[PDB]
Write a protein that binds this ligand. Structure first.
Ligand SMILES: [Cl-]
Length: 229
DNA sequence: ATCCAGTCTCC
DNA sequence: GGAGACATGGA
């Protein structure tokens, strides 16, 4: 039987039905059940598909693709790079904020790390791999997620209206060949982790995104976050 | 003071 | 991919 996540927007359910029905996805699911039995796996299972829940396929105008979820306790909750109200801003997101402060005039980094207000504007906050074992970055690489996130990329690429794809890191950048739509734009760099920050700083992805959207008659993203959440 | 938050080079 | 070099600014 297909293993279909609950409460997805209908457009995602229709686009991704073949994935939820596929043998590779059944095998990925079985592996993840074993992993959750034997280890602490992030994010919590109810949150794994939250990026799709918060940004319907029809609303996507920017697709941010990181590597894999944050791998410490109470960090990841399915929107890449985001943390819940109350949670310390992780290093990657501190670096995102540093780059925004330089790239977008007037951006003021808030004390929180909650990025829901970006998802609500059409920014799909994805990672190439959607789960991780505690303390072990990229521990779930190469187990089936990449086929599923290829399918997500492909569904967005099939849209006619311009989407900006921002590929952060080597693993996310493997998706570049799938982005063939004539109206789409790809921005790529190193990941914003402090361990790769020399490959991220100065790449101006936020302004480049807004310029591309504007030239296509799409509205820019409001990158400023609320001061409190 | 230690620990802990990627990607390049050769084979 | 494997092994190692070089990767950081804070709690
Ligand atoms: Cl994440």
């Amino acid at each position: 039987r297909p293993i279909i996540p609950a409460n997805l927007p209908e457009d995602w359910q229709e686009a991704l039905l073949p994935e939820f029905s596929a043998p590779y996805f059944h095998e990925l699911t079985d592996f993840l059940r074993q992993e959750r039995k034997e280890y602490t796996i992030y994010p919590p299972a109810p949150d794994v598909f939250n990026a799709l829940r918060y940004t319907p396929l029809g609303e996507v105008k920017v697709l941010i693709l990181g590597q894999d979820p944050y791998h410490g306790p109470n960090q990841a909750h399915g929107l890449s790079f985001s943390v819940r109200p109350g949670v310390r801003v992780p290093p990657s997101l501190r670096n995102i904020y540093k780059e925004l402060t330089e790239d977008i005039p007037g951006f003021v980094a808030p004390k929180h790390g909650y990025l829901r207000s970006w998802a609500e504007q059409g920014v799909l906050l994805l990672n190439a791999v959607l789960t991780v074992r505690a303390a072990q970055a990229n521990s779930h690489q190469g187990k089936g997620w990449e086929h599923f996130t290829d399918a997500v990329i492909k569904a967005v690429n099939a849209k006619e209206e311009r989407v900006v794809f921002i590929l952060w890191g080597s693993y996310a950048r493997k998706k570049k060949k799938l982005i063939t739509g004539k109206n789409h734009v790809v921005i790529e760099s190193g990941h914003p982790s402090p361990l790769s920050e020399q490959y991220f700083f100065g790449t101006r992805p936020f302004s480049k995104t807004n310029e591309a959207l504007e030239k296509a008659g799409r509205g820019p993203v409001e990158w400023q976050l609320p001061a409190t959440v």
